[PDB]
């Protein structure tokens, strides 16, 4: 692999020099990328046929660098949250949350006024206080009684229709993992696949993992058995 | 139970970077209000007293911090070094650009200072200039204060 | 000392959409790139392939084999 350049070069880095030297060696000739994205591998052929050989590899290099930068940013946020600091990167909302309306979604800022609570060390709220708050927020009270007020139903809508199997033993069926049912069945039909000599790559679909090995085995046994039929 | 080692190498590799301009796609106003709102709301001419107290406290805090900082000897060494560097670089720039400027009009060491005390190399007209500018800037504070507070 | 935080979100900057805590909600954000659970081992395969190149854990044995 040192000649197919599939792995990093012979002695590009060893951990006993200077990170100063180790970078220079890293940025000599596109050693900061694997081959599949390196443009030196593709700079020689780009033709009328597809026009993707030099474009659809630059469009992959770009996503690569974007993911690397995202990792750097998320780690800076994790470092700012390991202490109690405010996180520096304000990312957009996601599939369960909306942006704060009071602020813009910017969650903090500098103000020229000294933030007395940090200076005097009064930032965090003393566990018992939060306990009391949450305990009085999860336990609302009904001071009116249905005796006088003609409401015998609990709050909500469609109460009249609101009041119209083996969940008490095994219980619920988990619906997030049907996509593996098939595979498990196969793992029961062929016990020999459970030996330590086999090491399947992995995955769920028919194009991944155990089904690949099964298809290979069955097609090859049929192929060469029909090869036996020629003689 | 094993024992762990100190790591001296490419340590964490992610503080080497200022990536804020990339992540926030460029290519603090609700704050200074909640503050003033609170001190107006919670505590016959009392709110003006509280606000003046806040502004004076904040300005004094920043000034006390700066003076306490530069009251350390090594920090004075630091600022002296930066001053001689900026003086020499300004001298280079001045020579070059003034020479090219009167050319366009035609168209149409370090140790002697770094090892000597500060005041013997700097003239007095410089500090007199600084003082005159300061005085001229702030000489209208009493009248502005008086007019502001009194209707 | 000078850092202040929005008091309504407590510095989070982002509040909850209760419509989802219990074709869907259209107020609350765009699903992330990893919400697709049926694309997990594929992305992991690509990433571990790319990571196999940079790796130098078996550097000495590969070196003396070369």
């Amino acid at each position: 692999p040192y000649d197919a350049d599939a792995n990093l070069g012979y002695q590009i880095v060893d951990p006993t020099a200077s990170m100063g030297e180790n970078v220079w060696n890293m940025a000599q000739v596109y050693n900061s990328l694997p081959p599949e994205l390196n443009p030196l591998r593709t700079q020689h052929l780009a033709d009328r046929g597809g026009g993707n050989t030099q474009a659809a590899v630059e469009a992959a290099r770009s996503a690569f660098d974007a993911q690397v930068v995202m990792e750097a940013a998320l780690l800076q946020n994790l470092e700012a949250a390991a202490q109690d600091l405010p996180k520096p990167h304000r990312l957009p909302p996601t599939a369960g949350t909306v942006a704060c309306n009071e602020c813009g979604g910017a969650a903090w800022g500098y103000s020229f006024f000294p933030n007395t609570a940090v200076m005097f060390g009064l930032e965090r709220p003393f566990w018992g206080d939060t306990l009391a708050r949450l305990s009085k927020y999860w336990n609302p009270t009904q001071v009116a009684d249905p005796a006088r007020t003609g409401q015998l139903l609990p709050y909500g809508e469609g109460g009249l229709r609101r009041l119209l199997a083996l969940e008490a033993v095994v219980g619920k069926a988990p619906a997030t993992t049907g996509r593996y049912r098939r595979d498990l069945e196969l793992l029961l039909a062929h016990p020999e696949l459970r030996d330590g000599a086999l090491r399947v790559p992995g995955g769920w679909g028919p194009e991944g993992g155990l089904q690949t090995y099964l298809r290979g085995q069955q097609e090859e046994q049929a192929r060469m058995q029909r090869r036996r039929d020629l003689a | 139970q094993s024992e762990h080692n100190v790591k001296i190498f490419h340590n964490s590799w992610w503080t080497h970077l200022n990536i804020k301009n990339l992540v926030n796609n460029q290519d603090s106003e609700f704050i200074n209000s909640a503050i003033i709102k609170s001190i107006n709301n919670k505590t016959s001419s009392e709110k003006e007293t509280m606000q003046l107290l806040l502004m004076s406290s904040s300005i004094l805090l920043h000034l006390c911090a700066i003076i306490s900082l530069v009251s350390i000897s090594q920090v004075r060494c630091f600022v002296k070094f930066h001053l001689i560097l900026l003086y020499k670089l300004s001298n280079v720039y001045n020579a070059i650009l003034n020479q090219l400027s009167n050319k366009l009009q035609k168209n149409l060491g370090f140790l002697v200072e770094w090892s000597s005390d500060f005041i013997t190399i700097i003239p007095e007209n410089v500090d007199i200039y600084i003082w005159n500018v300061f005085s001229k800037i702030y000489r209208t504070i009493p009248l502005s204060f008086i007019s502001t507070t009194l209707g | 000392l000078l850092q202040h935080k929005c008091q309504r979100c407590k510095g989070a900057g982002v509040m909850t959409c209760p419509a989802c805590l219990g074709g869907g909600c259209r107020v609350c954000g765009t699903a992330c790139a990893w919400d697709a659970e049926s694309e997990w081992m594929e992305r992991w395969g690509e990433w571990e392939s790319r990571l196999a190149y940079y790796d130098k854990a078996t550097g000495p044995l590969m070196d003396e084999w070369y």
Binding site: P114, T116, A117 | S38, I39, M50 | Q7
Partner: peptide
């Protein structure tokens, strides 16, 4: 600032 702290401290919900 210690005079103003009980007043400013309501921006966090504390005493």
């Amino acid at each position: 600032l210690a005079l103003l702290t009980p007043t400013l401290l309501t921006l966090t919900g504390q005493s």
